[PDB]
Amino acid sequence: APVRSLNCTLRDSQQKSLVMSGPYELKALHLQGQDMEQQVVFSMSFVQGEESNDKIPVALGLKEKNLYLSCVLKDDKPTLQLESVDPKNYPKKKMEKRFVFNKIEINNKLEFESAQFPNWYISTSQAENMPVFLGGTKGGQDITDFTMQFVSS
Burial 37-48, CB ≥16 within 10 A → b, else e? eebbbbbbbbbe
**Which domains occur in the chain, in start order?**
1-153 (2.80.10.50)
Separation CA 37–CA 94 (nearest Å): 31
- Longest CA–CA span in the chain (Å) reads 41
Separation CA 150–CA 22 (nearest Å): 25
Does residue 121 contact residue 110 with C-beta atoms inside 8 Å?
no
* 91 prior amide bond cis, ω within 30: yes
Reported resolution, Å: 2.0
- Reduced to 3 states (helix: H, G, I; strand: E, B; else coil), residue 33 is helix
Q: Please classify residue 144 by burial: count the beta carbons closer than 10 Å to its beta carbon, then call 0-12 exposed, 13-18 middle and 19+ buried.
A: buried
Short-list 69, 132, 62, 133, CA closest to 101: 69
> DSSP character for 115?
S
Separation CA 63–CA 78 (nearest Å): 25
- Reduced to 3 states (helix: H, G, I; strand: E, B; else coil), residue 19 is strand
Contacts of 75 (CB under 8 A, 6+ apart): none
Tally the residues of the chain: 153
- Phi and psi (nearest 5°) for 36? -80, -25
Separation CA 18–CA 13 (nearest Å): 12
- Reduced to 3 states (helix: H, G, I; strand: E, B; else coil), residue 109 is coil
Contacts of 123 (CB under 8 A, 6+ apart): 132, 133, 134, 135, 142, 143, 144
The identity of residue 21, as a single letter, is: S
Contacts of 16 (CB under 8 A, 6+ apart): 28, 29, 30, 31, 124, 128, 143
Does residue 100 contact residue 115 with C-beta atoms inside 8 Å?
yes
Q: How many Cα neighbours within 13 Å face the side chain of 44?
A: 16
Q: What was the elucidation method?
A: X-ray
The three-state DSSP-derived secondary structure of 50-105 is CCCCCEEEEEEEECCCCEEEEEEECCCCEEEEEEECCCCCCCCCCCCHHHEEEEEE
